[PDB]
Design a protein around this ligand. Structure first.
Ligand code: K
Ligand code: K
Ligand code: MG
Ligand code: MG
Ligand code: MG
Ligand code: MG
Ligand code: MG
Ligand code: MG
Ligand code: MG
Ligand code: MG
Ligand code: MG
Ligand code: MG
Ligand code: MG
Ligand code: MG
Ligand code: MG
Ligand code: MG
Ligand code: MG
Ligand code: MG
Ligand code: MG
Ligand code: MG
Ligand code: MG
Length: 150
RNA sequence: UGGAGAGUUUGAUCCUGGCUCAGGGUGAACGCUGGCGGCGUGCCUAAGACAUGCAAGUCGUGCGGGCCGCGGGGUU
């Protein structure tokens, strides 16, 4: 019912008298490929607990994506921190062209053809957050005319 | 009908930032290897120096001759 894929897994270290102590962080995307996505970042002393926690957090943070024939309705450009994500809809038969992080996010969202570009900071976390805010800032023509009723 | 990034400064992080890699290209060269054909292509350097052969001539329907030869005339 819900597909779950990890973006990256990293091991961080804090200094304590005696040595360094490790804490694992993991990004996880979850999607039904129908228009709903979710991003989560979990931290835990071990890796599997971090992956499970990231899955829970991702299921708790969902985003409804207005797909229009496997693609996006309009091009977007989002700055998260120093990271920039540029999205642009594509005709069918194009395929998803993106870095690993935005490719995973968009594929789990149900996108089939789109063009992207990562700019500035290539940080996977910030790129993921920028992609999420881009999908959150998407508007359909119905939404546009709904906002301009008056 | 068109756009992917990654490695690397830190104990760990975010940023800035350079270096590097994955791609495509060549009148190429070098190493190892090397079976056939078609179509292309082949002094990027000394516009340095060149043996040798060929590469620009053709018209007797413009004109008069020379040399070699033959035939027929004026003459016993
Ligand atoms: K901003
Ligand atoms: K790192
Ligand atoms: Mg929406
Ligand atoms: Mg900025
Ligand atoms: Mg940069
Ligand atoms: Mg069109
Ligand atoms: Mg167009
Ligand atoms: Mg860099
Ligand atoms: Mg330093
Ligand atoms: Mg180090
Ligand atoms: Mg320090
Ligand atoms: Mg190359
Ligand atoms: Mg090459
Ligand atoms: Mg040989
Ligand atoms: Mg040949
Ligand atoms: Mg030839
Ligand atoms: Mg030359
Ligand atoms: Mg040249
Ligand atoms: Mg004439
Ligand atoms: Mg005679
Ligand atoms: Mg007589």
């Amino acid at each position: 019912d819900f597909e779950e894929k990890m973006i990256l897994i990293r091991r961080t270290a804090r200094m304590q008298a005696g040595g360094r102590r490790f804490r694992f962080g993991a990004l996880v995307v979850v999607g039904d490929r129908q228009g709903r996505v979710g991003l989560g970042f979990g931290k835990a002393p071990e890796v599997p607990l971090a992956v499970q926690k990231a899955g829970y957090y991702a299921r708790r943070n969902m985003v409804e994506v207005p797909l229009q024939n496997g693609t996006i309705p309009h091009e977007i450009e989002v700055e998260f921190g120093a990271s920039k994500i540029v999205l642009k809809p594509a005709a069918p038969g194009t395929g998803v062209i993106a870095g690993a992080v935005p490719r995973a996010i968009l594929e789990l969202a149900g996108v089939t053809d789109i063009l992207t570009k990562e700019l500035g900071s290539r940080n996977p976390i910030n790129i993921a957050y920028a992609t999420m805010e881009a999908l959150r800032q998407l508007r359909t023509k119905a939404d546009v005319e709904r906002l301009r009723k008056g």
